[PDB]
Ligand binder design. Structure first.
Ligand SMILES: CSc1ncc(Cl)c(Nc2ccc3c(c2)CC(=O)N3)n1
Ligand SMILES: CSc1ncc(Cl)c(Nc2ccc3c(c2)CC(=O)N3)n1
Ligand SMILES: [Cl-]
Ligand SMILES: [Cl-]
Ligand SMILES: [Cl-]
Ligand SMILES: [Cl-]
Lengths: 4, 123, 123, 4
């Protein structure tokens, strides 16, 4: 999971 | 403020290909010079400008069989159908002309672009 | 010896979401506490272990309406349906418990994992 | 396009  | 799962789109496509390989919920047969290819209308539309136009047509959206132009090579189609479900294109010296012609007909712009570049490199 | 187009899976999913937003070729209604959500069976199966089991069942594969367990929160479902079609999860303090419970029911393992981690960080 |  990432900060888009 | 959303979070994003990097591998999600790839995992979705991998599962769609698993459904294709087991013939699960396929809703159309694409006929190419007597060769038959089963697929999901939604995936075809998501990958091809031609299929997008066909399955948004009020009459054609209901067809279970689509016959392609007789000039379309079945091997070229098979390579492009594999690309649609995997992101991998099996481009070879012996098939590049048939692949580019089929991708131009199917309106798959990114495939047409890489074929043009690979052909330009060989001249 | 294939070549790969990096953005292909993301572009496919973006087009599938465009079809969902215009209600094109949606083939199922998911009912959650009287709220209705239209979607593509193939996308639901590709994202959820529960939908995969439902639509591979010889009787249920033919249903146009699926009713979820009454404990399922419609907002939690809506957030997960948006994640299925975009890879983006709108996870907030006020919805994390409903999102995790819905993802456990839908069998969406990667969502359950990030919810567990975000909850563990707050304690 | 890349070599996968
Ligand atoms: C244009 S809006 C839109 N909405 C939904 C879909 Cl399923 C769709 N597909 C599609 C249209 C055109 C092209 C492709 C896909 C690939 C390509 O090279 N050209 N387009
Ligand atoms: C297991 S083979 C397979 N073949 C095709 C599909 Cl459409 C599919 N989907 C599916 C099954 C289980 C789970 C998910 C999707 C997401 C998750 O967390 N668990 N699985
Ligand atoms: Cl027909
Ligand atoms: Cl393309
Ligand atoms: Cl029904
Ligand atoms: Cl998941």
């Amino acid at each position: 999971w990432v900060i888009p | 403020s959303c979070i994003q799962f990097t591998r999600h789109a790839s995992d979705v496509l991998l599962n769609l290909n698993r459904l294709r390989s087991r013939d699960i919920l396929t809703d159309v047969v694409i006929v190419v010079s007597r060769e038959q290819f089963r697929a999901h209308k939604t995936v075809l539309m998501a990958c091809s400008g031609l299929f997008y136009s066909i399955f948004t047509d009020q009459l054609k959206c209901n067809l279970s069989v689509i016959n392609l132009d007789p000039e379309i090579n079945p091997e070229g189609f098979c390579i492009l159908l594999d690309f649609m479900y995997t992101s991998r294109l099996n481009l070879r010296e012996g098939n590049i002309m048939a692949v580019m012609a089929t991708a131009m007909y199917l309106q798959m712009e990114h495939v047409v672009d890489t074929c043009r570049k690979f052909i330009k490199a060989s001249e």
